[PDB]
Amino acid sequence: HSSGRENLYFQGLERLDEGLRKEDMAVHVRRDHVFEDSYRELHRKSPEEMKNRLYIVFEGEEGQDAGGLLREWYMIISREMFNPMYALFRTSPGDRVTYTINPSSHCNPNHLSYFKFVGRIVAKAVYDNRLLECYFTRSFYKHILGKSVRYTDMESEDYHFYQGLVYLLENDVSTLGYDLTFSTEVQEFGVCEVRDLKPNGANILVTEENKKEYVHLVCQMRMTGAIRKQLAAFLEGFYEIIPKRLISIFTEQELELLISGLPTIDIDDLKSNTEYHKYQSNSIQIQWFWRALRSFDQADRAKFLQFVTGTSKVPLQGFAALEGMNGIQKFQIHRDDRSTDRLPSAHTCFNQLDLPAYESFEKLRHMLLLAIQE
Ligand code: NA
């Protein structure tokens, strides 16, 4: 990552700055109105204007340290961005801690422009190497990167539908008893429609050799169909500061770490807050697991967390506060029992690692690491 790519990205960004001389720029804001005043103050700016040094003025409160204020301000925008009152962002039902665009955002009639704005902010922060406590779904990170969602990502977004997809994948198409079509229901702006996944989609049956393309098409549609206009607006704001070709250098895991930064994983904390199914605390590959995880630099530790959890966010209260689809859910490890040439797999909504009974430490370590990236 730092092995070349991150650094080209800075090189390429600095090259667009060539001959841009930045200014200082006021943000006049009231304390109880920080978010909306900030919108009013910045949304009509140009992208180039938006690359200026911000300094923030809190109306009618005593003169303060500019640096401390800007930091304070970014923190407020971070939390207020995700305030349910604006109806912009909604939590992952699987991962509880992560956010995407709320399909019901249209009840705020400014939502479209607020989405462009929040896009500009996120990208300004990244541009200026300011870290935000913003934690999105991996599907959302994939959207910024222009990367397609895999059916896997559906487990924490729509459990029943994901279960539907798995069933279709593992079964013969006439074994279903019913037959599917190249179309799904979508509720955009409150309105329900059945959208085709391709021309004449509604009249094209899914078959044994259709079903992969079907699964691909339906996930994209399901994940972005209600969201289209909001995403476009977000992506508009973001790409105006960081061009799409530049940001696309990163993977989805990397992108997240870039915005919010690298998390700290206290392994005594995590270990003290782990559950086991089929394995015991002292099963040999559990001991091997802990030994393995501890041997990871913090890059790989963070990526492992993303893998098993669906986010890089460590809870403020520690891993005893770890959450999942069914509520409070500790990290847990199961022995899966399928063949040993599998990689380990995760189901993030249950904060769950499925770990095969590997024959040796070195094999487990090597195999876990593989699972952590591709
Ligand atoms: Na999770």
UniProtKB/Swiss-Prot annotation:
Function: E3 ubiquitin-protein ligase which mediates ubiquitination and subsequent proteasomal degradation of target proteins. Regulates apoptosis by catalyzing the polyubiquitination and degradation of MCL1. Mediates monoubiquitination of DNA polymerase beta (POLB) at 'Lys-41', 'Lys-61' and 'Lys-81', thereby playing a role in base-excision repair. Also ubiquitinates the p53/TP53 tumor suppressor and core histones including H1, H2A, H2B, H3 and H4. Ubiquitinates MFN2 to negatively regulate mitochondrial fusion in response to decreased stearoylation of TFRC.
Domain of life: Eukaryota
Compartments reported by the entry: Cytoplasm; Nucleus; Mitochondrion
HECT domain: residues covered: 46-374
Disease link: Intellectual developmental disorder, X-linked, syndromic, Turner type: An X-linked neurodevelopmental disorder with highly variable clinical manifestations. Common features consist of moderate to profound intellectual disability, delayed or absent speech, short stature with small hands and feet, and non-specific but recurrent dysmorphic facial features such as macrocephaly, microcephaly, a broad nasal tip, deep set eyes, epicanthic folds, short palpebral fissures and a short philtrum. Patients may manifest other features, such as hypotonia, seizures and delayed bone age.
Protein family: Belongs to the UPL family. TOM1/PTR1 subfamily.
Annotated active site: C349 (glycyl thioester intermediate)
Residues the record lists as Phosphotyrosine modifications: Y279
Phenotypic consequence of Y276S: Loss of activity
Protein name: E3 ubiquitin-protein ligase HUWE1
Impact noted for substituting R71Q: In MRXST; increased protein levels in patient cells
Record's comment on post-translational modification: Phosphorylated on tyrosine; phosphorylation is probably required for its ability to inhibit TP53 transactivation.
Domain notes for this protein: The HECT domain mediates inhibition of the transcriptional activity of p53.
Tissue: Weakly expressed in heart, brain and placenta but not in other tissues. Expressed in a number of cell lines, predominantly in those from colorectal carcinomas.
Quaternary structure annotation from Swiss-Prot or TrEMBL: Interacts with isoform p14ARF of CDKN2A which strongly inhibits HUWE1 ubiquitin ligase activity. Interacts with MYCN, POLB and CDC6. Interacts with isoform 2 of PA2G4. Interacts with NR1D1. Interacts with AMBRA1. Interacts with HAPSTR1. Interacts with HAPSTR2. In hepatocytes, interacts with PAQR3; the interaction promotes PPARA poylubiquitination and STUB1-mediated degradation.
